[PDB]
Amino acid sequence: STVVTTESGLKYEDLTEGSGAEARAGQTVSVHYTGWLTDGQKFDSSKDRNDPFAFVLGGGHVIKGWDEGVQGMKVGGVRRLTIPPQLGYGARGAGGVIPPNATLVFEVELLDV
Amino acid sequence: STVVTTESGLKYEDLTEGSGAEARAGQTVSVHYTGWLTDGQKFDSSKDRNDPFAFVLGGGHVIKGWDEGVQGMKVGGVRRLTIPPQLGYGARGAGGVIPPNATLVFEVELLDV
Ligand SMILES: C=CC[C@@H]1/C=C(\C)C[C@H](C)C[C@H](OC)[C@H]2O[C@@](O)(C(=O)C(=O)N3CCCC[C@H]3C(=O)O[C@H](/C(C)=C/[C@@H]3CC[C@@H](O)[C@H](OC)C3)[C@H](C)[C@@H](O)CC1=O)[C@H](C)C[C@@H]2OC
């Protein structure tokens, strides 16, 4: 599998290519995800709550790295995102979970579009 | 299981009670469904398309019987809705699938909220 670095600085890698429908901006998508800090510390997983996460792709209600990075996935796909801080939580971080200026790694599994 | 007839004329019956979170107006819910006419002719199923159906419960983008009927389901539950035409497609029906003045029967499986 290849790694793609976009103009924004996002990096992504398809760990498994999906066989289903393609995710496009505008669609309401459902995913499972896991998030880690660059030291390997897991900070969150939707699988731990057994609760798929739904959002409007390109809707501006998730961090920029997600809105950009989930586009192009196919249902059944697992994509790994490496999100630099300007496309995540930037200088502020996310109180008690994500430090200031953090690069974030997510694995995203696309369940439906 | 019991059958409930609401003030609107909607009838619903919980074929299986869900064990997960309750569906409330406002939530974006994901379901599988099958739809039939009162003579048992199947007109649609999301299972046949392998494509779960997401919608905003109470958002007015589904027939009135759905917006009302899916409220109160729990994740994992299967609810049968009997929808009179005034809470469905009324006198117009829906070209080449649902005739005028059709009572509709749906089975709805709540996948996520
Ligand atoms: C009303 C609020 C509750 C509402 C909560 C949910 C829908 C449940 C949902 C599963 C979130 C998780 O709850 C278990 C939990 O997910 C994290 O652990 C996480 O993995 C993460 O990073 N995710 C979630 C998955 C999408 C990407 C990213 C995100 O974009 O999250 C978004 C986020 C926090 C954006 C901030 C918003 C503030 C800005 O200042 C900042 O701008 C830089 C960016 C989330 C989706 C918000 O849009 C909406 C919410 O917050 C956060 C570390 C903290 C967060 O809990 C709050």
Ligand SMILES: C=CC[C@@H]1/C=C(\C)C[C@H](C)C[C@H](OC)[C@H]2O[C@@](O)(C(=O)C(=O)N3CCCC[C@H]3C(=O)O[C@H](/C(C)=C/[C@@H]3CC[C@@H](O)[C@H](OC)C3)[C@H](C)[C@@H](O)CC1=O)[C@H](C)C[C@@H]2OC
């Ligand atoms: C932009 C258009 C595409 C867009 C299509 C999708 C998102 C895909 C989605 C799975 C629909 C199915 O696509 C395969 C297919 O589902 C049926 O087979 C069906 O089982 C059905 O009855 N459903 C769908 C499940 C929710 C309840 C109900 C519905 O409320 O459907 C709504 C409906 C048709 C409402 C009419 C709208 C016009 C009014 O005049 C009338 O007012 C009384 C009510 C649907 C969700 C619309 O909001 C949005 C759309 O149409 C219809 C028999 C025909 C319909 O395809 C068209």
Ligand SMILES: [Ca+2]
């Ligand atoms: Ca959910």
Ligand SMILES: [Ca+2]
């Ligand atoms: Ca879908």
